[PDB]
Amino acid sequence: MIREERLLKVLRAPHVSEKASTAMEKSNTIVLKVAKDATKAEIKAAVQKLFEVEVEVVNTLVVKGKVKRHGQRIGRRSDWKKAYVTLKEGQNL
Amino acid sequence: SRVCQVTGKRPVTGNNRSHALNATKRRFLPNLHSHRFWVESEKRFVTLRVSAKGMRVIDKKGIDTVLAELRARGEKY
Amino acid sequence: MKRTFQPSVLKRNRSHGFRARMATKNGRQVLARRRAKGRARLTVSK
Amino acid sequence: AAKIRRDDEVIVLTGKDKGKRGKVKNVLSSGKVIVEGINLVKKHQKPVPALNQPGGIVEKEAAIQVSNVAIFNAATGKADRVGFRFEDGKKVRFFKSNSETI
Amino acid sequence: MKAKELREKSVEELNTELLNLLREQFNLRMQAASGQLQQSHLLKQVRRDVARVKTLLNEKAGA
RNA sequence: UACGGUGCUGAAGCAACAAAUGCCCUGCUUCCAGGAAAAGCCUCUAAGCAUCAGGUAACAUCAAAUCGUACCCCAAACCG
RNA sequence: GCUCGCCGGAAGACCAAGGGUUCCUGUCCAACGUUAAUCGGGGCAGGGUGAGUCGACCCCUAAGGCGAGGCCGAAAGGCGUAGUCGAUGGGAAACAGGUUAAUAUUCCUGUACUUGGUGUUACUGCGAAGGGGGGACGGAGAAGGCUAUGUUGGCCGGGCG
RNA sequence: AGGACCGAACCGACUAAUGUUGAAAAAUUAGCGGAUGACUUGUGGCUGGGGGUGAAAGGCCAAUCAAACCGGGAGAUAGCU
RNA sequence: UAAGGUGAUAUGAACCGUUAUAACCGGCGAUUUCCGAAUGGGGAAACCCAGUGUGUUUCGACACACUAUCAUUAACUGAAUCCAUAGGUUAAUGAGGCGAACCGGGGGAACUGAAACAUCUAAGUACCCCGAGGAAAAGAAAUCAACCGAGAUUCCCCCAGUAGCGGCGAGCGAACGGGGAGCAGCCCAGAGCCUGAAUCAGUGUGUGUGUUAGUGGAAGCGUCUGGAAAGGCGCGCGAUACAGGGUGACAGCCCCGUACACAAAAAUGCACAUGCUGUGAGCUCGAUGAGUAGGGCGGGACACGUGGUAUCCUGUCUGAAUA
């Protein structure tokens, strides 16, 4: 039936609830911060198993981490991938 | 590779000496030749990159005993 | 003037990259020399 | 092993006060214990949110070194040194030249 | 009864690992992203428990 | 009026002419200096398989993963 | 905000290389800005790049590179067959309108297109590092027919200065 | 048709002037030569130092060339400062 | 070992234990993404894409294991060609790559010195490559000696800047013998005889000595100055501990220590008294190693530059006798 559940730890954290995620929430979709290697099928199965809601489509985006520190100690933020999973009718999240 | 394949003569180096005793460096490379040797035991011709002194070793020892020495030395024909 | 340095990542990673160095014996020597020096950026790749 | 533990009545030998005696609060990892009423200092606390909101001239205990403070003998009103003498998993601390365990 | 892991020296602990990860570490990460307090020590505790039951599943093939 | 931007409504929405270096054009004509390769694609059999496999048309369903996507756009983000 | 000037085969716009957060928002003006700066590509913090149809990846090859054996070398190594790489070329498919402060052939609305897997109905000789066809290719020149586009006229909404 | 003619892009660099502690480690402003060809350009490749390449100048080979750059012989030697 | 911890800048929040399972330290075990010899193919290191085999399933697809090249061996297949052989496939065992120096070998300069320079020197140095080990090489006399004799190799001190070589210039430079450090010889070309009789490895019960954690460990108080005594002044005490580091100024008696006693679950280094296995001791004598020694022609090494030039190595051509 469903893919093995130890690989359903891909969903890391939802979001910070900023206005892009919330405006896109009140229009159609929820925004999720997910893994680094999670396939769109894995994000979809993880939503449909760990949450109770079916999902129409996933849009996957990885975003570069920032440098964010000054010249005394140059650092870099870790890369992360964000998913827009589409929940069209009966959205409960 | 210029190896005698039965006795292992190799190009060795030693300088040219002139009348004014000058030392320009040259090579003493062997008299290698490719010869097909008839073996009675396996009933087949076999080629070998052999110096002329190696062919003297061939005609003295015999083809099969020096081929057995090559096979014990673990070197292809 | 057309300046000397005209950048291209293909040409850079095929002339001074890790695989452009580890194919040749002297490239393996320069990589081991930079390892013995202790450098963080071994080659020009990143 | 540690010669002065979490909650023992100790007396100082060197450093500002000498005769004042107190109970050790905690032992720092760096070997600078806190014993109350001994190393007082009134600092200047900045106005910061949440913890210590107004600030003030709040007195807090500063760190006294372990070697400057000794374990006070309960029976006789003196400082005393202590040592360890036992073989199994529990080492008793006993008063030197009183030979009484703590 | 000899070691201090007698709760994990029992049989069929893979469903214990699954209960310890599935929705447990997940919902702990959910409210850690949302922001709470006892969660701060709770996710290290449950991560160590998941590591412990995973090596107990690795040291024997009988559970 | 958050003074930029939002909800509703929104008339006519046509002809003639001039139109390229773009399209027909991987065309036509002409010339010598005679103008890549392989794959996708279309057929044919070899060994094999004969209610098999496979192909063809229709319909239904499912899948199309992963990476790049901001910004500079002949320049204050490239090379100097 | 109203005027003035400059470019407008760019000093406008979009790709590629290259760079890498410089993009957008709130805040600050020590250091950078050849001056002050409330401002900035500056500090700090938060936000932002959504793809079956656009590229890469993928399937093929060119110049050329690597090369099992192999041939040649004092060793190191040089060359090269099978093969395997290499786009700057050849291979399947999406447009118009709207949206954000920041993304759009990617989100939304409408209308579609392409390649495979599976299942069913009916027909049936299917079958390849193999053969053939195709892909498949130059320069120059002249029409002819158009379209992108522009001008005028009608029409419409305003003007009566 | 043409290594045809005038002339933009584009390629180049003949004269002058300014710059010459410049806007710039060879440029700007007027003029100038070619501009369907022996043209020009993007992308990738090949040729490595007593070597390459050269419509030939000792030209060019990373602002460096009668012989590249880097490291090692090497603290060369220096009857000379 | 333990009353304190969750490594640092680094505070904070939230927690864990208080002699019995917090942390910390030690042995063994577990996981160990991707790249990298990188090893499934490829590539622009940290990426793209495969094949086979097991398992799960309204079925979208996932999980794990294996799959590089070469050498040796074994099996099966197998052409021109009849047999074979070349070739192909499978399985086992091993290698690959890195590393500062030491060792052996294949190559091998020039600056410089000669007050130039070519013979010579620098120098078989710098450098390149190959290979191996904890050391490597060498090593058991076809060696020296001098009519007396020593008995393998290597390393140190003399012989000795000597004999000698040398545009007899620059310069290079031994040996014999003596004093030491260490000191062990053996085997095949061979048959028969008695035949794991003594050594060499592997593996093991057990002991000892180490290592990888550690445990005890002496004895100081007044007063003065001072911000603070470890300094000054008095009286004591410990020392197989007055090495050392901190402690608010200079501490034997404040704390870690140090001298000195003790300690090992668990794994590994030597001595093995030792059980088993593999190789083999000692009597007779056949031979005691042929394209070799030697030679001619070019060279190289030996301190030795071909000179009167012995000895060793060989690129070319020849070539014996065999106790």
From Swiss-Prot, chain C:
Coiled coil: none annotated. One of its GO terms (biological process) is translation. GO terms for molecular function: structural constituent of ribosome. One of its GO terms (cellular component) is ribonucleoprotein complex. Keywords: Ribonucleoprotein, Ribosomal protein. It holds the Pfam family Ribosomal_L34. Gene3D superfamilies: 1.10.287.3980. HAMAP family: Ribosomal_bL34 (MF_00391). Belongs to the bacterial ribosomal protein bL34 family. This is Large ribosomal subunit protein bL34.
